[PDB]
């Protein structure tokens, strides 16, 4: 069922295309979602981050221009998780992509070694 | 290098960890995590190596953790504040910890300790 795997991406992004190619190659049904047009909300981020097992900074798009001009490189430490999550929910360009969300795990960016948990 | 195995004798998960390292022929050096507690310099290097949030290095069954309501508090604290707290006393740190040059493991999840060859 495609409703059990949520794929959040930005279609012009090069890592996304690769990931999407991998999901189809591997026969994984999923539900598409545009991370920028329909950006993660606080309530989502607050469920997705713990499931990912990763630091909240790992959910930042550090290749982004929006990241760059808000100087988040320097600012992120000085921010609490609450503040970092609140920020993330304000702009989808700020969120790492792609993300895949399932009931048991969340994957951040495209790491084929890790995306195998979906098989 | 040495493989530090930081633990608390009376803890049953550390006991399970130790049992697993011996069973699986992995060479380690025992360290008492309470008596010989992780320093700020150790935490600042170990935390990046584990790939976990700083949050995950807290002993969630310790007395300070519970009495300070550290589950509701920790997200209101910066990484640096969390590390300075963690360094104050060994009973605050999640156990067991295994430390090598390549990586750091926190708590005992048998599948993840596969990295130890």
TrEMBL record, chain A:
CDD domains: ArsC_like. Transmembrane segments: none annotated. It comes from the Bacteria. Belongs to the ArsC family. NCBIfam families: arsC_related. This is ArsC family related protein. It comes from Bacteroides fragilis (strain ATCC 25285 / DSM 2151 / CCUG 4856 / JCM 11019 / LMG 10263 / NCTC 9343 / Onslow / VPI 2553 / EN-2).
């Amino acid at each position: 069922n495609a409703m059990k795997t949520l794929f959040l991406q930005y279609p012009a992004c090069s890592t996304c295309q690769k990931a999407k190619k991998w999901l189809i190659e591997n026969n994984i049904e999923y539900t598409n979602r545009l991370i920028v047009d329909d950006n993660p909300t606080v309530e989502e981020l607050k469920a997705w981050i713990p499931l990912s097992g990763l630091p909240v900074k790992k959910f930042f798009n550090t290749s982004g221009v929006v990241y760059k001009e808000l100087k988040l490189s320097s600012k992120l430490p000085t921010m609490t998780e609450e503040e970092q999550i609140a920020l993330l929910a304000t702009n989808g360009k700020l969120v790492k992509r792609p993300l895949v969300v399932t009931e048991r795990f969340v994957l951040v960016g495209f790491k084929p070694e890790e995306w195998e948990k979906l098989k």
